[PDB]
Each structure stands twice: as structure tokens, then as C-alpha cells.
Amino acid sequence: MRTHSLRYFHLGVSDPIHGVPEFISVGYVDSHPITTYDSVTRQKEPRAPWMAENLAPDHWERYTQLLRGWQQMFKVELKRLQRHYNHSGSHTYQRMIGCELLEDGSTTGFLQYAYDGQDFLIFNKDTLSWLAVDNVAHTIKQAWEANQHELLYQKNWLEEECIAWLKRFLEYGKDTLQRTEPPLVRVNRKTALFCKAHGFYPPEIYMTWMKNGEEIVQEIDYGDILPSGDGTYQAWASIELDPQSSNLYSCHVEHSGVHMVLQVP
Amino acid sequence: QNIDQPTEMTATEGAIVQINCTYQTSGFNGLFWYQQHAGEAPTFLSYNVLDGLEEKGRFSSFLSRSKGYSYLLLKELQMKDSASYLCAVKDSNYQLIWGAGTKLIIKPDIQNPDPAVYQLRDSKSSDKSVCLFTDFDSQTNVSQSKDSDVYITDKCVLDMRSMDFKSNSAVAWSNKSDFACANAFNNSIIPEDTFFPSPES
Amino acid sequence: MIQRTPKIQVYSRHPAENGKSNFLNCYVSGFHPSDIEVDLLKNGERIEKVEHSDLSFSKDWSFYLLYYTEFTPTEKDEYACRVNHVTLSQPKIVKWDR
Amino acid sequence: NAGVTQTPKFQVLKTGQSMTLQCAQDMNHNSMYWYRQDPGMGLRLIYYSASEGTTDKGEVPNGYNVSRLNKREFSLRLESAAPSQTSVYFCASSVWTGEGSGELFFGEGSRLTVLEDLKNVFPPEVAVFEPSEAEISHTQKATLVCLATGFYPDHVELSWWVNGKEVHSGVCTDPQPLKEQPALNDSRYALSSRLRVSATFWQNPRNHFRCQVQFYGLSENDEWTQDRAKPVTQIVSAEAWGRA
């Protein structure tokens, strides 16, 4: 199997405009939303049909209760941060947790928090400690690091539980997540050569330009990998043409174990 | 999913005892031990979630995630360790599964056994005759009566703190005419040297 | 705080050919905080039937969204995507550059 | 700083009667739980409340309902009692539901017995038996015995009082009652306790010993139709004086 990841995000907002939720949580496998909860629906619900089909109503009912508890803990935690930063107005608090199962079989795990969209606290599950970015974080770090049982619980969850959930969801969603749609690749002129790929899945792809068999990264413009809307992706890369000398340019594309070369005549 | 622990264990004061808990779960988010004295509320003892041994006072708790087993180790047992010990496992959905509990019975170390069966004084408000088997060593077991009109309680440990003195006793009573302390504990195996004071004329 | 202004990219689902049905996409990304207003335009006016993904989360704590609508491209019809955010003083219009 | 407070400690109910158990915690905890404990099995969750404003069923919700009235309080309602609801009920709380390692703080327990008819309810008969003179001369100690017999259900608290003060040193009370007729489902119970003192203490004629059993039984609004006296909640005691 290729590399895969499972991640859960929380967002709290302290003074949201009317109608907008003070709390949202979304889970992802790779790029795919799999679950969603917010303080307006107050229900945890599937976001992918293969989650809805493989997890019984008692799963959703239970995690709905757990996310209502998270919603309240996030409100309290954000109230305390904003008081300690001495900040008025609307501020955000975010959490991200997850793991990756790499192609070679190795694993990774991560857990971190942000305040107003900037790193705040970062967990190291090998040294069993929290990195604090400022003195407000440093106060929280002290309280959390005094609870060594909870550090050990988080290490176990990242290393064993998260990877087990990920393998379970990967099997649920295998028709979607383990498929391969190769790219359709073309070269155009607009003076620069554009190497364009579309229709591919998974989104991970590597496109570059080589000039007389040499790669010059600082000369290449790299487009983003963008969703096409139908479950596949598109991307591009461009390089500027030298009007004073001929050169042999080639677009190189790697995707899911297959390499492609388009030599420009 | 299930969790299993022995129903009861008996050990001697001063010794060591290991209470085992094995579990079969889908997912594992940590294992708890609680103590519950008879008639009281469980109270938290320990939590393990990675492999290894954790010490706290005379109690240690061990966990092996790969064999799905934990033990609670109590060293230098005291009478006050007599209690039930409950293990509980948090499963993949963070719900606790509780073991049925292990009742730990501690045998006091009786320094100077003086086994005897005494007749207590009648109460003017009661038709019962009452007999006390007392001061025997902790290896003696007291069996239930075989006569329906004779009532025999199980042994109980009493502590006279002022004298740092412990003793076992069991009580037998009946309102039957044929009842006598000389035969009250006839269904138990009692020490050969048990003292039977003579009845009055 | 540090507020991040949205990156706005307009593009078709498939390589566009005039007279062939397609989807026009507006992918808005990299912005913080999460409140945002997005409209697709035809010849400078707002398209009514426009769909979008749920708010999505990136690991650098920013957000992204995809807005899209079904259309058939023609020679005379100009398309854009208009975005408003706390980081922008006036709405930002990005034209579909084919 | 009381922790978890639940009430009542004891209650007898007739089949079909309604009952509310109360539970409050003063620990500013978010999560609260109601469990039942029965012989031979682990605790079973009835209902829980992950946070103020939400509740959900546990493993055995049928025949029960709950109210998370506010952050502190979580009540358990038995609308129409069934004999299978005879049990010991524990309320518990924890800081929140997300603390993987978070422990439960338990209340003191509520013992409920549900009966088809209250005619099987009896208070204890209580009697005290003075020490054996042979024991006093053989050991220089003196053991009094208290017998509480014939009571049902097993809702009793036995205590010893020496010179008007409750004592615990030198006391041993059976941890479980004896069934007077072991075969019968509804057997009445017996309970013995011992108080052992020095012979010098027993031989002071002004020392006063009392054994007291608090029985938890019927209330004013339980209906009583039997010929014998209504078995209400009451204290039964017996006494003895030291003997020179």
C-alpha cells in the first residue's frame, strides 16, 4: 500500500458572528473527509459513504456524546488562553491529532495545538513532553506535564489506537482510497512551456522540467495540486523558454510508481 | 469483549499477593485498578497503559499489552488490605469494561493461639444460648451448622489496638434444649487442644 | 494576530472546449481566520446555482474551500470568482484565465 | 470538599413504586455516571452524562431514566420498580470524558430492595450476652456478643456504644449476614458482632455497654395491612453493665 494518514481537527472560535459555529471537528483519511461535528448540529456524522455503511448507529451516538464533551472543554480552554493573553474580540483555538502508516511499514504520530492559527503546543511522544512557544503555552505545558499518565495515554493512542483505526478505515474505503487513476499529461506553449496533468488519483504527483537532461529547480514554476471536483486532481509546472539558444526540454511526471517523460521537439 | 479475574484469594498477613486481570477487547486505552472495601465505594488505585511496572507505596501494578494481562501486587499485607480489587479496561470507544472483582481475604498471624469454646451469659430478654469459639490460629475453618435450629457465623478478626492483639472468633447460638457449647462446633474441625470450660452444676 | 489572506485559483474541471459542458472551479485556500465569502461570476454578475465543499483544514492551521458550478464555456462569456475576507479591504476578483 | 454525595443509603420499594436517587458532586467535574453493582459480575453502566446539557444510555438503561439537572447534580429515576432492580447503585464522576487516564470518583452507594409484597419486611430482634467468667479468668479479656436476628431486608447498621460514645476498637461485626433459612429466597437474616475489652475494663461496675442496630424499613406512606406492627425505620438496642 502507499502511505496513508488519519487526522482529526478541532476548531474553537471565541466570539463567532451570528450563525457561525463556535466549535467544529472534522476527521480525514488522506484528503477525504470522513466525519464531521459542530456546535450547531451537535451531532457527529459521516462525511464519506463508506464510513456510513460500515459503522453502526451506536458508533455515531457514542462519538456524538464524546464530541459534546470536547465542545465544552474547548470553550473553557479558549476562555482561559484569551484571558492569559489579555486579548479581546474573537480568537481561535485549534487542535490536530493523527498518524501515518508509511509504505515501508513504519508509522508516525503527531498532536499539536494552535492559537489564532499559529503553533501553540506541540507533543513529542518520544520524550513525552510538550513544546511551548510562549509563556501562556508554558503555563499549560507545566500543568499537562505534571499528569504523566495522560502523556503515556496519548503516546499509546498515537502509536497503537490511531494506526488500528486507520487500517480499519482503509479497508472500509479501499475501493476509493487504494485505487489509481493515472494522469493525462500534455505540454502547451503560453514564452514558457506548461506541463499539465489532470484526471489523476491519488493527489500525490511529482512534475518537473529537465533541460538537456539536467534539473534546475529554481527555474521551474510549480503549480499547486488542485481538486477537479470529481474525485480526481490536476496540476502543472512551467519553465521559461530561452529565445537565444535551442535546448531539449522534457517534462517528467511521477505518479504511483510510474514515471513519464514528455520530450518537447 | 471480556475481562477476567479470580473470584477470591486468601493470603497471610505479612506476605505478598498478586491479583491477576486478563482482558480481551477491541482496542485498548488503559487499565485501571480500584479498591472496594465491603460496604464502601470503589476508590482509584492505579492506571497502566504502556508495558511495565509502576510502584506506589506497598502496591505495584504491571501491564503487558501483548498478552492482555495486568496484575496488582500487594506487598507486606495488612488486615486493612482485606477488600475487593476491581480491574477495568478502557476499550477503543473509551468505555470501561469492569471485571467482576477479586475478594482478598487476609489471615492474621496469631502469635499465641489459645483455642477455646466459651458459654456466654444468658440474656433475661432472650431465649437463646450463645457460644463463642475464639483465639484459634488462622488455619482453622468454621463450618456452617448441620442442624436447622442452630446458627453458626463465620470467623471474624478482631483487633484490640491498645494491646496490639488480634484474635479469630465465631459465634454459635440456638434456643433448642439439646444445645450445648460442648457440641456447638461439632461439624467443624477444631484444634485438638481447644479448651472447653466445665459447665455449672 | 497573524491573519492570512486567501489564495484564489479559478480553473475548469476538464480542459475547456467551447460548446462542451464543464465545471468551473474556484479553489480558495491558505486563509485564516475561517470566515469567508465566495461568489462565482458570469460577465460580472453572480451565478445563482453554485455549490461548495465544507470548510476544510490544512495541517498549517489554514483553511480551504472549493466552489464550483456547471457551465458550458463560450467565446464571449467571461467568468470570475469574487472573494471577501477580513484580510481584504475590498472584494478580490480573479478572472478565469483560459 | 465533600466529593460525590448520593442519597438515599438504603431503600425498600414495592413492585411498581417510583423512586429517585440523587447525586451531587462539588468537584467541578464535567462527567457523571450511574452504575449498578450485582453479585458475580462487574459494574454495569445504566446512564451517563458526558457534560452538562447531554445524557445517554449505558449498557443497562431499561427501567431507568436520568436527569442532568445542572453541572453538579445527576439524578436516577426508577419509574416503576421491578424486583430485578434490587441492587446497589453507585453514582460517579470524572473531570471530563476525554481524559484517557482520568479516574472515577464514586459516591457511597444506595442499596435498593424491590419486593412484590412488604409483608416479608421485619426489624431485627437485638440481644446482648455478657462475657464468660471462664474466658475472663483464662485470658484476662472479656468478650460481649450482640445478636441481631430475624430482620429483612439486609438494611442494617450495627454499632457499639461504651459509656455513651460509639467505639470501634475491639469490635468485629460479621461482614455478611447469615440467612436463617439458607434455602428460601426471602429468608430473614441474622448478624453477630463481638466487642472485646480487658477484664479490668469489664469489671468496673460503672462501665455501660450498648449494641444498637439501625434498621432501614418502611415509611409513613408505605401501605401496611398485616396484624403485626408496621416495620418502620427504627433503632433497636440492648445493653449491659460492667460486673464487679
Coordinates of N, CA and C in Angstrom, one line a residue, chain D residues 136-228:
Chain D
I136 N -12.8 -14.8 81.2 CA -12.1 -13.8 81.9 C -11.0 -14.3 82.7
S137 N -11.2 -15.5 83.3 CA -10.0 -16.0 84.2 C -9.0 -16.7 83.3
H138 N -9.3 -17.2 82.2 CA -8.3 -17.9 81.3 C -7.5 -16.9 80.6
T139 N -8.1 -15.7 80.2 CA -7.4 -14.9 79.2 C -7.2 -13.4 79.7
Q140 N -7.9 -13.0 80.8 CA -7.9 -11.7 81.3 C -8.5 -10.7 80.2
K141 N -9.3 -11.2 79.4 CA -10.1 -10.4 78.4 C -11.6 -10.8 78.6
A142 N -12.5 -10.0 78.0 CA -13.9 -10.3 78.2 C -14.6 -9.9 76.9
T143 N -15.3 -10.9 76.3 CA -16.0 -10.7 75.0 C -17.5 -10.6 75.2
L144 N -18.1 -9.5 74.8 CA -19.5 -9.4 74.7 C -20.0 -9.7 73.3
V145 N -21.2 -10.3 73.2 CA -21.7 -10.6 71.9 C -23.1 -9.9 71.7
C146 N -23.3 -9.3 70.6 CA -24.6 -8.8 70.1 C -25.1 -9.6 69.0
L147 N -26.4 -10.1 69.1 CA -27.1 -10.8 68.1 C -28.2 -9.9 67.6
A148 N -28.3 -9.7 66.3 CA -29.4 -9.1 65.6 C -30.0 -10.1 64.7
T149 N -31.3 -10.6 65.0 CA -31.8 -11.7 64.3 C -33.2 -11.4 63.7
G150 N -33.5 -12.2 62.7 CA -34.9 -12.1 62.1 C -35.2 -10.9 61.3
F151 N -34.3 -10.2 60.8 CA -34.6 -8.9 60.0 C -34.6 -9.2 58.5
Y152 N -35.3 -8.4 57.8 CA -35.4 -8.5 56.4 C -35.9 -7.2 55.8
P153 N -35.4 -6.6 54.8 CA -34.2 -7.0 54.0 C -32.9 -6.7 54.8
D154 N -31.7 -7.0 54.2 CA -30.5 -6.7 54.9 C -30.1 -5.3 54.8
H155 N -30.9 -4.4 55.5 CA -30.6 -3.0 55.5 C -30.4 -2.6 57.0
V156 N -29.2 -2.9 57.5 CA -29.0 -2.6 59.0 C -27.6 -2.0 59.1
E157 N -27.4 -1.3 60.2 CA -26.1 -0.8 60.7 C -26.0 -1.1 62.2
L158 N -25.0 -1.9 62.6 CA -24.8 -2.3 63.9 C -23.6 -1.5 64.5
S159 N -23.8 -0.9 65.7 CA -22.7 -0.1 66.3 C -22.7 -0.4 67.8
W160 N -21.5 -0.2 68.4 CA -21.4 -0.4 69.9 C -21.1 0.9 70.5
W161 N -21.6 1.1 71.7 CA -21.6 2.3 72.4 C -21.1 2.0 73.8
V162 N -20.0 2.6 74.2 CA -19.4 2.4 75.6 C -19.4 3.7 76.3
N163 N -20.2 3.7 77.4 CA -20.3 4.9 78.1 C -20.8 6.1 77.3
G164 N -21.8 5.8 76.4 CA -22.4 6.8 75.6 C -21.6 7.3 74.4
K165 N -20.5 6.7 74.1 CA -19.7 7.0 72.9 C -19.5 5.8 72.0
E166 N -19.7 6.0 70.7 CA -19.5 4.9 69.8 C -18.1 4.4 69.8
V167 N -17.8 3.1 69.8 CA -16.5 2.6 69.8 C -16.3 1.7 68.6
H168 N -15.1 1.6 68.1 CA -14.7 0.7 67.0 C -13.5 -0.2 67.4
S169 N -12.7 0.2 68.3 CA -11.5 -0.6 68.6 C -12.1 -1.8 69.5
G170 N -11.6 -3.0 69.2 CA -12.1 -4.2 69.8 C -13.4 -4.8 69.3
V171 N -13.9 -4.3 68.2 CA -15.2 -4.7 67.6 C -14.9 -5.5 66.4
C172 N -15.7 -6.6 66.2 CA -15.8 -7.3 64.9 C -17.2 -7.7 64.6
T173 N -17.7 -7.2 63.5 CA -19.1 -7.5 63.2 C -19.1 -8.3 61.9
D174 N -19.9 -9.3 61.8 CA -19.8 -10.2 60.6 C -19.9 -9.3 59.3
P175 N -19.1 -9.5 58.3 CA -19.2 -8.7 57.1 C -20.4 -9.0 56.3
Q176 N -20.9 -10.2 56.3 CA -22.1 -10.6 55.6 C -23.1 -11.2 56.6
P177 N -24.4 -11.0 56.5 CA -25.4 -11.6 57.4 C -25.5 -13.1 57.1
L178 N -26.0 -13.8 58.1 CA -26.4 -15.2 57.9 C -27.8 -15.3 57.5
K179 N -28.1 -16.2 56.5 CA -29.5 -16.5 56.2 C -30.0 -17.5 57.2
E180 N -31.1 -17.1 57.9 CA -31.6 -18.0 58.9 C -32.2 -19.3 58.3
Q181 N -32.7 -19.2 57.1 CA -33.2 -20.4 56.3 C -32.5 -20.4 55.0
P182 N -31.3 -21.0 54.8 CA -30.5 -20.8 53.6 C -31.2 -21.1 52.3
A183 N -32.2 -22.1 52.3 CA -32.8 -22.5 51.1 C -33.7 -21.4 50.5
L184 N -34.5 -20.7 51.4 CA -35.6 -19.8 51.0 C -35.1 -18.5 50.3
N185 N -35.7 -18.1 49.2 CA -35.3 -16.9 48.5 C -35.4 -15.7 49.4
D186 N -36.4 -15.7 50.3 CA -36.8 -14.5 51.1 C -36.4 -14.7 52.6
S187 N -35.4 -15.4 52.9 CA -35.0 -15.8 54.2 C -34.8 -14.5 55.0
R188 N -35.2 -14.5 56.3 CA -34.8 -13.4 57.2 C -33.3 -13.7 57.6
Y189 N -32.7 -12.6 58.2 CA -31.2 -12.6 58.3 C -30.8 -12.6 59.8
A190 N -29.6 -13.0 60.0 CA -29.0 -12.8 61.4 C -27.6 -12.2 61.2
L191 N -27.2 -11.5 62.2 CA -25.9 -10.8 62.2 C -25.4 -10.8 63.6
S192 N -24.1 -11.1 63.8 CA -23.5 -11.1 65.1 C -22.3 -10.1 65.1
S193 N -22.1 -9.5 66.3 CA -20.9 -8.7 66.5 C -20.3 -9.0 67.9
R194 N -19.0 -8.8 68.0 CA -18.3 -9.0 69.2 C -17.7 -7.7 69.6
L195 N -17.7 -7.4 70.9 CA -16.8 -6.4 71.5 C -16.0 -7.0 72.6
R196 N -14.6 -6.9 72.4 CA -13.7 -7.5 73.4 C -13.0 -6.4 74.2
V197 N -13.0 -6.4 75.5 CA -12.3 -5.5 76.3 C -11.4 -6.2 77.3
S198 N -10.6 -5.4 78.0 CA -9.8 -6.0 79.1 C -10.7 -6.5 80.2
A199 N -10.3 -7.5 80.9 CA -11.1 -7.9 82.1 C -11.2 -6.7 83.1
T200 N -10.1 -5.9 83.3 CA -10.2 -4.8 84.2 C -11.3 -3.8 83.8
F201 N -11.4 -3.6 82.5 CA -12.5 -2.7 82.0 C -13.9 -3.3 82.2
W202 N -14.0 -4.6 81.9 CA -15.4 -5.2 82.1 C -15.7 -5.2 83.6
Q203 N -14.8 -5.2 84.5 CA -15.0 -5.4 85.9 C -15.3 -4.1 86.7
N204 N -15.3 -3.0 86.0 CA -15.6 -1.7 86.6 C -17.2 -1.6 86.5
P205 N -17.9 -1.6 87.6 CA -19.3 -1.6 87.6 C -20.0 -0.4 87.0
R206 N -19.3 0.7 86.8 CA -19.9 1.9 86.2 C -19.7 1.9 84.7
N207 N -19.1 0.9 84.1 CA -19.0 0.9 82.6 C -20.3 0.4 82.0
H208 N -20.8 1.0 81.0 CA -22.1 0.7 80.3 C -21.8 0.4 78.8
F209 N -22.4 -0.7 78.4 CA -22.2 -1.2 77.0 C -23.5 -1.3 76.3
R210 N -23.6 -0.8 75.1 CA -24.8 -0.9 74.4 C -24.5 -1.3 72.9
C211 N -25.3 -2.2 72.4 CA -25.3 -2.5 71.0 C -26.6 -2.0 70.4
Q212 N -26.4 -1.3 69.2 CA -27.6 -0.6 68.6 C -27.6 -1.0 67.2
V213 N -28.8 -1.3 66.7 CA -28.9 -1.6 65.2 C -29.9 -0.6 64.7
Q214 N -29.5 0.2 63.7 CA -30.4 1.0 62.9 C -30.9 0.1 61.8
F215 N -32.2 0.0 61.7 CA -32.9 -0.7 60.7 C -33.5 0.3 59.7
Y216 N -33.3 0.1 58.4 CA -34.0 0.9 57.4 C -35.1 0.1 56.8
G217 N -36.4 0.7 57.0 CA -37.5 -0.1 56.6 C -38.6 0.8 56.0
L218 N -39.8 0.6 56.5 CA -40.9 1.3 55.8 C -41.1 2.7 56.3
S219 N -41.8 3.5 55.5 CA -42.0 4.9 55.8 C -43.5 5.1 55.9
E220 N -43.9 6.4 56.3 CA -45.3 6.7 56.6 C -46.2 6.4 55.4
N221 N -45.7 6.6 54.2 CA -46.6 6.4 53.0 C -46.6 5.0 52.4
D222 N -45.8 4.1 53.0 CA -46.0 2.7 52.6 C -47.3 2.1 53.3
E223 N -48.0 1.4 52.5 CA -49.3 0.8 53.0 C -49.0 -0.5 53.8
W224 N -49.6 -0.6 55.0 CA -49.4 -1.7 55.8 C -50.8 -2.3 56.2
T225 N -50.9 -3.6 56.0 CA -52.1 -4.3 56.2 C -52.0 -5.6 57.1
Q226 N -50.8 -5.8 57.7 CA -50.6 -7.0 58.4 C -51.0 -6.8 59.9
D227 N -51.2 -7.9 60.6 CA -51.6 -7.9 62.0 C -50.5 -7.4 62.9
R228 N -49.3 -7.7 62.6 CA -48.1 -7.3 63.4 C -47.8 -5.8 63.2

